[PDB]
Design a protein around this ligand. Structure first.
Ligand SMILES: O=P(O)(O)c1nc2cc(Cl)c(Cl)cc2nc1P(=O)(O)O
Ligand SMILES: O=P(O)(O)c1nc2cc(Cl)c(Cl)cc2nc1P(=O)(O)O
Ligand SMILES: [Ca+2]
Ligand SMILES: [Zn+2]
Length: 390
């Protein structure tokens, strides 16, 4: 009805466009422009870690709604409830991502109204947008991966995981998730087998946190298994996925390794951070000639066959630089991953020691692993940052 669009204009009067129109935020008049900018840059930190782990940055299907991501942010939990009347989806949540619409619906909130800030919640839900676009073929809720609870622990656990994405230090654990784990009685911790068979029909939802613990355990202590699992999902190889799950679930030593990892996480609760974008992203960086940015980045990261695209956003322009990295002799796909991450984070941290504050906006990932005929590690490498040269 014209009555509903009229209401929607009133509740979401502001429109902010990023990335040549592929990332749109509509927001209430009480949502600060500062917060809008933080959410854009948060998306890039999460996107970068996700593509490093998964190894793919090409949309799986052509012409889906999520070619454009739309975020709708109501002013408050109270005005959020009008979203059910307006767009016909549930508001019994802190937010909701609807894949067929490429739309995330949520609301700004005070620390008194939720434990999770808006940026922290967005970091989690944006991970679902990434899973659906770049990892899980077909629509959410369909196909073999949406039977037998196959991906329930994974989808929620990795969303909690990737919400802890940082700029230069990989993925870090979040205080709030570690707090839930720390408050559990030790002998009520989920076994590895129980976590990998948990469902949304469960009654307690602690599985989100034990699912995170699985993801973080694999990330930190068994990255080969984590890569093989993601490759199985990416290739819709149900057989390989089920074999991995069965091997993890039936091995008593793997569960003890996982239990000990939970204890390490719990021990880290007190001093754990909440990864959120730096204020550096909001500073005025000053002019820097564009080709000097590209040249300096390409040299520090030892890239060849480089290309660059520039994109327009509400408040700034950005660039995406792509190149090929060819390193030394491969120590295998999994030991290669680890050294590539260390190299890329070191390069990002070296560039940020530069006087140009614009280098503090850089995010980077690698994808499409392969070895050369000379058995040399090779990757496509992608950098993203602000561009202050019109
Ligand atoms: O829909 P909600 O209610 O917005 C949701 N919000 C969450 C917020 C945080 Cl920050 C964390 Cl820790 C987990 C969450 N999981 C969900 P989910 O989509 O899987 O129900
Ligand atoms: O992201 P933040 O949270 O903006 C950051 N702030 C810092 C503040 C000070 Cl005062 C010092 Cl000395 C170091 C910092 N390092 C960081 P970094 O990016 O390298 O983790
Ligand atoms: Ca999908
Ligand atoms: Zn979720």
């Amino acid at each position: 009805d014209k009555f509903l669009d009229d209401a929607e204009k009133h509740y979401l009067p502001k429109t902010y466009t990023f990335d040549n129109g592929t990332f749109i935020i509509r927001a209430g008049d009480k949502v600060s422009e500062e917060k809008i900018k933080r959410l854009y840059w948060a998306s890039r930190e999460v996107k970068s870690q996700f593509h490093r782990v998964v190894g793919n940055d090409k949309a799986l299907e052509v012409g889906n709604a999520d070619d454009v991501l739309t975020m709708k942010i109501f002013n408050s939990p109270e005005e959020y409830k009008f979203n059910t009347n307006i767009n016909g989806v549930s508001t019994d949540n802190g937010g909701l991502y609807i894949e067929p619409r490429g739309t995330f619906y949520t609301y700004e909130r005070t620390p008194q109204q939720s434990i999770f800030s808006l940026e922290e919640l967005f970091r989690h839900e944006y991970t679902h947008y990434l899973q659906a676009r770049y990892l899980v073929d077909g629509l959410w809720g369909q196909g073999p991966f949406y039977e037998k609870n196959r991906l329930t622990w994974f989808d929620e656990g990795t969303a909690e995981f990737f919400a802890g994405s940082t700029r230069t230090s990989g993925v870090l654990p979040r205080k709030l998730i570690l707090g839930y784990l720390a408050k559990d009685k030790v002998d009520h911790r989920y076994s590895l087998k129980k976590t990998l068979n948990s469902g949304y029909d469960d009654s307690d939802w602690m599985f989100y946190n034990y699912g995170f613990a699985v993801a973080h355990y694999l990330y930190e202590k068994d990255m080969p298994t984590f890569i093989k699992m993601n490759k199985a999902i990416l290739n819709t190889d149900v057989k390989s996925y089920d074999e991995i799950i069965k091997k993890l679930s039936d091995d008593a030593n793997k569960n003890t390794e996982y239990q000990n990892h939970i204890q390490e996480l719990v021990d880290k609760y007190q001093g754990a951070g909440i990864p959120l974008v730096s204020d550096d992203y909001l500073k005025d960086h000053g002019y820097k000639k564009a080709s000097e940015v590209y040249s300096e980045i390409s040299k520090a990261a030892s890239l060849t066959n480089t290309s660059v695209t520039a994109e327009k956003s509400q408040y700034f322009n950005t660039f995406t630089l792509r190149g090929t990295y060819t390193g030394e002799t491969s120590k295998g796909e999994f030991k290669d991953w680890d050294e590539m991450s260390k190299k890329l984070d070191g390069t990002l941290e070296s560039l940020a020691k530069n006087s140009w504050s614009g280098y503090k906006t850089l995010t980077a990932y690698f994808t499409n692993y392969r070895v050369t005929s000379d058995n040399k590690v090779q990757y496509d490498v992608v950098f993203h940052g602000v561009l202050t040269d019109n």
